[PDB]
Design an enzyme around this catalytic site. Structure first.
Site, PDB file in Angstrom:
ATOM      1  N   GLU A   1       8.052  -4.285  -2.923  1.00 45.57           N
ATOM      2  CA  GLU A   1       9.220  -3.401  -2.942  1.00 45.57           C
ATOM      3  C   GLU A   1      10.343  -3.903  -3.855  1.00 45.57           C
ATOM      4  OE1 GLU A   1       9.562  -3.082   1.329  1.00 45.57           O
ATOM      5  OE2 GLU A   1       7.568  -2.088   1.299  1.00 45.57           O
TER       6      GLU A   1
ATOM      7  N   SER B   1      -2.701  -3.967   4.921  1.00 48.03           N
ATOM      8  CA  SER B   1      -2.753  -3.424   6.277  1.00 48.03           C
ATOM      9  C   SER B   1      -3.470  -4.373   7.247  1.00 48.03           C
ATOM     10  CB  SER B   1      -3.432  -2.056   6.291  1.00 48.03           C
ATOM     11  OG  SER B   1      -3.348  -1.485   7.591  1.00 48.03           O
TER      12      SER B   1
ATOM     13  N   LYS C   1      11.292  -5.073   7.287  1.00 54.34           N
ATOM     14  CA  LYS C   1      11.785  -4.229   6.205  1.00 54.34           C
ATOM     15  C   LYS C   1      13.145  -3.671   6.586  1.00 54.34           C
ATOM     16  CE  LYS C   1       7.199  -3.626   4.238  1.00 54.34           C
ATOM     17  NZ  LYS C   1       6.258  -2.607   3.714  1.00 54.34           N
TER      18      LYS C   1
ATOM     19  N   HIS D   1       8.570  -9.608  -3.098  1.00 50.89           N
ATOM     20  CA  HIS D   1       7.915  -8.548  -2.341  1.00 50.89           C
ATOM     21  C   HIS D   1       7.677  -7.320  -3.245  1.00 50.89           C
ATOM     22  CE1 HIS D   1       7.038  -5.487   0.691  1.00 50.89           C
ATOM     23  NE2 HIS D   1       6.659  -6.498   1.455  1.00 50.89           N
TER      24      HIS D   1
ATOM     25  N   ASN E   1       7.415  -8.822   8.609  1.00 50.54           N
ATOM     26  CA  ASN E   1       8.421  -8.247   7.723  1.00 50.54           C
ATOM     27  C   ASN E   1       8.897  -6.930   8.282  1.00 50.54           C
ATOM     28  OD1 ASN E   1      10.075  -7.445   5.620  1.00 50.54           O
ATOM     29  ND2 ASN E   1       8.378  -7.066   4.167  1.00 50.54           N
TER      30      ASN E   1
ATOM     31  N   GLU F   1      -0.516  -9.100  -1.846  1.00 55.12           N
ATOM     32  CA  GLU F   1      -0.238  -7.735  -1.451  1.00 55.12           C
ATOM     33  C   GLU F   1      -1.120  -6.795  -2.261  1.00 55.12           C
ATOM     34  OE1 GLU F   1       4.348  -8.020  -2.015  1.00 55.12           O
ATOM     35  OE2 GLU F   1       4.015  -6.840  -0.213  1.00 55.12           O
TER      36      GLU F   1
ATOM     37  N   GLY G   1      -0.273   3.717   0.205  1.00 57.48           N
ATOM     38  CA  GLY G   1      -0.049   5.140  -0.053  1.00 57.48           C
ATOM     39  C   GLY G   1      -0.844   5.736  -1.190  1.00 57.48           C
TER      40      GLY G   1
END
Lengths: 246, 245
Positions: free
Chosen positions: B94, B208, B10, B92, B8, B162, B168
């Site tokens: 996001e 990750s 992005k 996704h 991906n 995911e 983060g």
């Protein structure tokens, strides 16, 4: 002496073959030299369209995000738009605002960034039916225009598009005189809040319903500087709308 | 279940930088037991498919739920197919958490994409607040449920877990924590759909992954591959391709 501006928003329509045909029609068309023509393909076909279209027609993206690269699956940046040979981006379109929930703040930020990257911007505004029937047309479009203005260092590469959302898909129709009333009120806002220079030179185009039949009358309104055309931009009828001042 | 490595990209890259990456990918030896798919930014689906060797499939990063219509800024599965891409990523993190795409919307997109002949990489996962409240299973089961209710055929779907709780946040997932969720999701497929669907559906890991971690993650019994983020923009992706080798 504001240059007449005709945008074709293809929306989520077309494939390579059908858009290829549409493009051949536009290439064969006589474009008046005093008129600025721009076409916005679906994002999958920006590159394709710029390659096939004659240079007398500019290419716009239909949306973008507010940083140059990032963790934003599904988005494109202004850098990518420029990299594909497109010089415009449409931002704040009623479908983005009202179907997909894009805030005024998000849109102002998109405008600043697209402008900082060298693109032109067609910044869209307008009130819904409930807002118009509640008497808050001015309040809504002034607030939308203010948020855009607060994210600007330079006005020369912006075009304002008034969309009467209240008259798109609701049964209601908008007159040429109603369009003119909103357009001159937006121009008056620019004069009193930005500058007379910006007021006199910024194109304010009409993004309500436009056809080969309605275009000449709409375009003769002194504050209507052109069009952001929806469905008709997919037809050869677009060429009539390009010629609305002729 | 064939091993599946998805990249991906992005919202990253330009013709020059992505052309270079594609050269690198075109030189990679793709194992016979492994399915490779790259998801360019939407402006470069067409570009990427033309430059990529067919041993790598191309995916859209998102799409809408109708074939044509008044949806400024959207693309349809028809356009994606028309550009030579055979997959799309849907749901996704996001799209869900930055752009507010609901479970219902995602379900509708899945149905329409599968019906138009695309494969679908369908993404699910919990946030940190949800993990620490103890509702990992509730969140991921609900997300997989709303999808399952907008689908009949499971053969063209790949589920991507995911761990949004590790993006983060200052927390990270161990291979064991990934295995644990993959196992519970295969468990939900068994109990809510069928045993057959549970045994054949790829469940790939979307947290990750690096060249350093990929082999340990791929060796987990219920982890059938990856949807790779940042490393997918680099030669390191070619090493992640080899994870089961």
């Amino acid at each position: 002496s504001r240059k007449f501006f005709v945008g074709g928003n293809w929306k989520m329509n077309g494939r390579k073959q059908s858009l290829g045909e549409l493009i051949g029609t536009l290439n064969a068309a006589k474009v008046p030299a005093d008129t600025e023509v721009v076409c916005a393909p679906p994002t999958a076909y920006i590159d394709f369209a710029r390659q096939k279209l004659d240079p007398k027609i500019a290419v716009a993206a239909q949306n973008c995000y507010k940083v140059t690269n990032g963790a934003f699956t599904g988005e494109i940046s202004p850098g990518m738009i420029k990299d594909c040979g497109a010089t415009w981006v449409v931002l704040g379109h009623s479908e983005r605002r009202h179907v997909f929930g894009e805030s005024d703040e998000l849109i102002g930020q998109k405008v600043a960034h697209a402008l900082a990257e060298g693109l032109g911007v067609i910044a869209c505004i307008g009130e819904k039916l409930d807002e118009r029937e509640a008497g808050i047309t001015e309040k809504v479009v002034f607030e939308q225009t203010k948020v855009i203005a607060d994210n600007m260092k330079d006005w020369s590469k912006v075009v304002l598009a008034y969309e009467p959302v209240w008259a798109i898909g609701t049964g209601k129709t908008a007159t040429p005189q109603q369009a003119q009333e909103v357009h001159e009120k937006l121009r008056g806002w620019l004069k009193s809040n930005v500058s007379d220079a910006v007021a006199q030179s910024t194109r304010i185009i009409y993004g309500g319903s436009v056809t080969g039949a309605t275009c000449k009358e709409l375009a003769s309104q002194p504050d209507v500087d052109g069009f952001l055309v929806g469905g008709a931009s997919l037809k050869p009828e677009f060429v009539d709308i390009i010629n609305a001042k002729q």
